[PDB]
Amino acid sequence: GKGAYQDRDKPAQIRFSNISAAKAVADAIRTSLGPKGMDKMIQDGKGDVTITNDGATI
Amino acid sequence: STLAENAGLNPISTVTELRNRHAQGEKTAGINVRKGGISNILEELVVQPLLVSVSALTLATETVRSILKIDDVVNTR
Amino acid sequence: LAPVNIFKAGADEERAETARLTSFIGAIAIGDLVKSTLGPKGMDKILLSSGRDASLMVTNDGATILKNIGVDNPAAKVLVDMSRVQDDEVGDGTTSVTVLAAELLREAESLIAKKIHPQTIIAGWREATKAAREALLSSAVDHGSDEVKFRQDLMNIAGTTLSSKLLTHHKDHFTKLAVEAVLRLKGSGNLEAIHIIKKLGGSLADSYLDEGFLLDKKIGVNQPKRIENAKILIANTGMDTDKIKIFGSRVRVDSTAKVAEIEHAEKEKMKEKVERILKHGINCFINRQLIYNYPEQLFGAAGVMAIEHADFAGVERLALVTGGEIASTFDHPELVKLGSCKLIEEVMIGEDKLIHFSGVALGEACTIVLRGATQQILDEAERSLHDALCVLAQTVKDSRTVYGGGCSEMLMAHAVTQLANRTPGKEAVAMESYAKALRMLPTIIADNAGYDSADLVAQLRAAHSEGNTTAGLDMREGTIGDMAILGITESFQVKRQVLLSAAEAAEVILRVDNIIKAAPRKRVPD
Ligand SMILES: Nc1ncnc2c1ncn2[C@@H]1O[C@H](COP(=O)(O)OP(=O)(O)O)[C@@H](O)[C@H]1O
Numbered sequence: 001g002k003g004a005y006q007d008r009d010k011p012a013q014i015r016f017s018n019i020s021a022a023k024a025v026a027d028a029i030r031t032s033l034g035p036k037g038m039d040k041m042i043q044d045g046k047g048d049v050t051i052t053n054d055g056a057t058i
Numbered sequence: 059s060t061l062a063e064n065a066g067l068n069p070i071s072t073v074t075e076l077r078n079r080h081a082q083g084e085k086t087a088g089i090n091v092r093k094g095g096i097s098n099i100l101e102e103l104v105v106q107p108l109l110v111s112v113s114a115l116t117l118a119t120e121t122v123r124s125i126l127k128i129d130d131v132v133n134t135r
Numbered sequence: 136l137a138p139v140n141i142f143k144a145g146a147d148e149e150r151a152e153t154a155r156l157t158s159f160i161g162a163i164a165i166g167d168l169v170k171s172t173l174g175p176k177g178m179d180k181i182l183l184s185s186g187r188d189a190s191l192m193v194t195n196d197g198a199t200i201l202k203n204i205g206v207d208n209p210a211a212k213v214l215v216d217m218s219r220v221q222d223d224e225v226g227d228g229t230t231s232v233t234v235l236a237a238e239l240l241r242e243a244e245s246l247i248a249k250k251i252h253p254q255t256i257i258a259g260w261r262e263a264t265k266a267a268r269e270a271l272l273s274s275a276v277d278h279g280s281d282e283v284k285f286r287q288d289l290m291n292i293a294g295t296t297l298s299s300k301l302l303t304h305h306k307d308h309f310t311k312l313a314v315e316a317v318l319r320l321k322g323s324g325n326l327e328a329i330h331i332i333k334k335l336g337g338s339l340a341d342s343y344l345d346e347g348f349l350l351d352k353k354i355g356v357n358q359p360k361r362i363e364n365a366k367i368l369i370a371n372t373g374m375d376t377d378k379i380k381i382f383g384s385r386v387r388v389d390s391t392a393k394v395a396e397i398e399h400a401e402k403e404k405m406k407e408k409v410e411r412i413l414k415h416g417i418n419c420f421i422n423r424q425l426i427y428n429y430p431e432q433l434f435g436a437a438g439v440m441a442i443e444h445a446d447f448a449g450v451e452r453l454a455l456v457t458g459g460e461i462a463s464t465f466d467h468p469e470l471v472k473l474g475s476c477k478l479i480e481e482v483m484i485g486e487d488k489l490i491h492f493s494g495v496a497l498g499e500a501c502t503i504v505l506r507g508a509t510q511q512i513l514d515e516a517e518r519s520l521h522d523a524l525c526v527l528a529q530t531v532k533d534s535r536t537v538y539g540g541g542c543s544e545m546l547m548a549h550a551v552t553q554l555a556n557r558t559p560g561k562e563a564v565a566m567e568s569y570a571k572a573l574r575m576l577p578t579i580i581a582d583n584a585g586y587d588s589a590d591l592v593a594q595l596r597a598a599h600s601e602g603n604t605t606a607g608l609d610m611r612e613g614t615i616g617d618m619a620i621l622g623i624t625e626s627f628q629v630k631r632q633v634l635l636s637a638a639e640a641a642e643v644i645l646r647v648d649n650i651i652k653a654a655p656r657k658r659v660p661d
Pocket residue numbers: 172173174175197227228229230231232295296298299539540541580608609610623625
């Protein structure tokens with residue numbers, strides 16, 4: 001109302017950083033959803049290659 | 059909208075048609091990739107168990123309520 | 136600085152003006168770091184590690200945070216040490232002790248700037264804490280005569296403890312589990328008798344306390360999978376090649392048929408021992424070690440259940456639940472007492488299969504199943520529930536309680552204020568600073584919720600001075616209220632430990648005037 005000034009901005013920034021980071025992951029796997037979605041290829045550092053559509057595996 | 063996008067359709071047009079058709083009667087209306095539009099779903103023999111939808115929703119809201127409690131990040135050993 | 140050098144290379148010294156500067160900077164630094172996690176509306180922090188392989192945890196506890204932080208200021212290590220000890224003592228109030236111990240030093244630096252000798256402050260505070268603890272004792276209310284009234288107090292204490300944690304989403308559900316679990320111990324403070332099993336999957340509200348017991352082991356092959364009206368023999372002995380004959384003997388024969396004779400004598404030894412076990416008339420057998428595949432079939436032919444590799448914890452818990460005896464040497468069947476449960480079966484939770492004991496005889500131990508969505512929720516739920524179980528166990532040991540929500544702090548802060556008005560000298564100033572520190576704790580709770588802390592605290596100060604010794608804050612609406620009506624209740628032992636420990640650390644730090652560091656060791660890893 002008239003007072004209760006919030007002098008700390010760190011909580012407001014960390015929340016907005018979490019919103020952006022969490023949203024990014026959902027946009028990453030949005031393609032692999034549906035009967036007409038496609039797969040992905042994951043190449044490990046060892047050299048292993050996997051081709052998958054499973055969302056937990058990606 | 060995501061299913062209507064991956065199939066090369068107009069997402070705005072499809073979802074607007076879907077919400078219209080669910081508000082005046084039938085509830086089984088859904089996206090039909092084979093036909094390319096919106097039609098009755100049970101005629102296409104596409105179903106799924108109830109536990110999949112309920113569990114997906116319940117686990118999602120529990121996590122989001124957990125995220126909003128966070129306030130700070132620090133580095134430890 | 137004297138021109139002559141007295142210290143080796145790398146060693147450093149700090150003195151009065153610089154020493155007291157560093158010690159105060161460290162203390163308020165740790166105090167302000169954890170103030171955000173205090174009260175019914177505090178938030179949680181994230182701890183991620185650069186060294187321990189990027190481990191990640193989300194917590195609200197004030198002691199877990201201070202253990203993982205890598206502090207290096209000498210004065211900050213004193214504050215961390217009190218918080219760890221407090222957790223191992225009563226299990227709650229880790230956040231309140233460090234904030235209070237830091238707010239005392241914040242007021243102490245201002246007093247030094249007014250040219251008062253440090254020894255004067257300490258002698259002043261020593262009188263303030265004595266009158267503060269005595270006033271708290273006169274506020275204690277002691278129940279225990281009436282079961283119905285005592286049952287209510289346990290629900291009130293557990294309800295208050297769970298407020299600041301993640302369990303506040305389901306406080307009603309989780310209050311019943313915590314209270315009923317502690318009533319099973321029948322007054323024995325063996326908290327290890329409660330096994331909290333946490334496995335991932337499902338909602339957080341699916342957690343419950345099992346009416347019997349659960350074991351995460353597997354039975355032998357080709358043995359009955361379920362038994363009704365079971366008799367249990369609990370043993371701690373060797374059965375996988377039990378022939379560890381302690382001596383240093385050896386076999387020396389001049390043929391091969393002699394070896395095949397001695398080999399057959401080995402199986403006769405194991406067979407004879409099994410018969411002496413079956414003489415007890417049992418139908419369920421539990422062992423804390425492995426079971427070889429030969430004695431396995433002996434039970435499989437006799438229609439018995441054999442559980443193997445249930446470690447010391449897994450055996451001692453079963454003894455309390457069913458009342459049997461952990462026996463060995465199996466030579467006198469009359470002197471050994473067996474257990475009794477109504478039914479044993481196999482149940483599936485999530486994916487795994489666990490052994491279910493139902494209708495047990497004693498039940499002086501229990502198991503709790505926790506469910507959730509993420510490993511962070513499961514860890515937080517288990518750690519939060521540890522606070523509730525411990526503080527309840529202290530209440531049963533000493534059943535006298537003190538009101539909370541800021542009602543307790545304002546009462547003691549007034550008692551010191553009355554004393555400071557009769558004492559002449561500079562000691563009067565120090566005692567007043569003690570009251571300023573105690574009253575900060577109710578203020579900090581109001582700040583985190585977004586309320587006018589100054590107005591609310593001002594009303595409390597007037598209410599406690601005019602004799603309304605049960606006034607205190609109400610979080611759900613941001614006004615004042617009665618605790619006898621609402622039911623915010625703490626433990627007398629917990630508040631006493633918070634007060635005494637906090638006042639001591641500000642004493643030991645304040646007497647220091649010189650800081651000396653030896654030259655550190657250099658990192659030359661293996
Ligand atoms: N419902 C409530 N109303 C008012 N005060 C509460 C309520 N629940 C908890 N508190 C207060 O919150 C304070 C801090 O407790 P907590 O958040 O667990 O931190 P600590 O680790 O110091 O116990 C306690 O002094 C208690 O009186």
